[PDB]
Swiss-Prot record:
It catalyses: a 1,2-diacyl-sn-glycero-3-phosphocholine + H2O = a 1-acyl-sn-glycero-3-phosphocholine + a fatty acid + H(+); 1,2-ditetradecanoyl-sn-glycero-3-phosphocholine + H2O = 1-tetradecanoyl-sn-glycero-3-phosphocholine + tetradecanoate + H(+); 1,2-dihexadecanoyl-sn-glycero-3-phosphocholine + H2O = 1-hexadecanoyl-sn-glycero-3-phosphocholine + hexadecanoate + H(+); 1-hexadecanoyl-2-(9Z-octadecenoyl)-sn-glycero-3-phosphocholine + H2O = 1-hexadecanoyl-sn-glycero-3-phosphocholine + (9Z)-octadecenoate + H(+). Activated by trypsin cleavage in the duodenum. Can also be activated by thrombin or autocatalytically. This is Phospholipase A2. Ca(2+) binds at Y28, G30, G32, D49. It comes from Homo sapiens. The inactive pro-form is a homotrimer. When anchored into the cell membrane, the inactive homotrimer is likely cleaved either by trypsin or by itself, producing an active trimer. The resulting conformational changes are thought to open up a center hole forming a channel for substrate entry. Interacts with PLA2R1; this interaction mediates intracellular signaling as well as clearance of extracellular PLA2G1B via endocytotic pathway. It is found in: Secreted. Secretory calcium-dependent phospholipase A2 that primarily targets dietary phospholipids in the intestinal tract. Hydrolyzes the ester bond of the fatty acyl group attached at sn-2 position of phospholipids (phospholipase A2 activity) with preference for phosphatidylethanolamines and phosphatidylglycerols over phosphatidylcholines. May play a role in the biosynthesis of N-acyl ethanolamines that regulate energy metabolism and inflammation in the intestinal tract. SUPFAM superfamilies: Phospholipase A2, PLA2 (SSF48619).
């Protein structure tokens, strides 16, 4: 679920404000997107949204993952590292992996403050 993803971000990025920092950034950070990503972080967000689009179209998950922002999974954080629990069922594991891969991607990417709250109608249409 989305509350678990934002806790993963706090785990790998100490002292971060996940909602205020990783939503409404570039062409892809936040719900949906368009055009092409503008930096490494925006590309992490495009990858994350593509992972969620595929989750809703998987043969064995299309109904269970109708809303991936509310589907609960099992995970843990230890010394700024994320682990997706081995007890996760098929569809739970898929969404936990989408989330863990995105949180790690964000922690390695530069944060370009000039891309926060980008005019997407203007710059994300090419
Ligand atoms: Cl988010
Ligand atoms: Cl970059």
């Amino acid at each position: 679920a989305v509350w678990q993803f934002r806790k993963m971000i706090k785990c790998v990025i100490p002292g971060s404000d996940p909602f205020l920092e990783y939503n409404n950034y570039g062409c892809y950070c936040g719900l949906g997107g368009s055009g092409t990503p503008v930096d490494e972080l925006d590309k992490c967000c495009q990858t994350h949204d593509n992972c969620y689009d595929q989750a809703k179209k998987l043969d064995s998950c299309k109904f269970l993952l109708d809303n991936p922002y509310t589907h609960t999974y099992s995970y843990s954080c230890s010394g700024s590292a994320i682990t997706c629990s081995s007890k996760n069922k098929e569809c739970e594991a898929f969404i936990c992996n989408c989330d863990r891969n995105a949180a790690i991607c964000f922690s390695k990417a530069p944060y370009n403050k000039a891309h926060k709250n980008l005019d997407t109608k203007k710059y994300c249409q090419s």
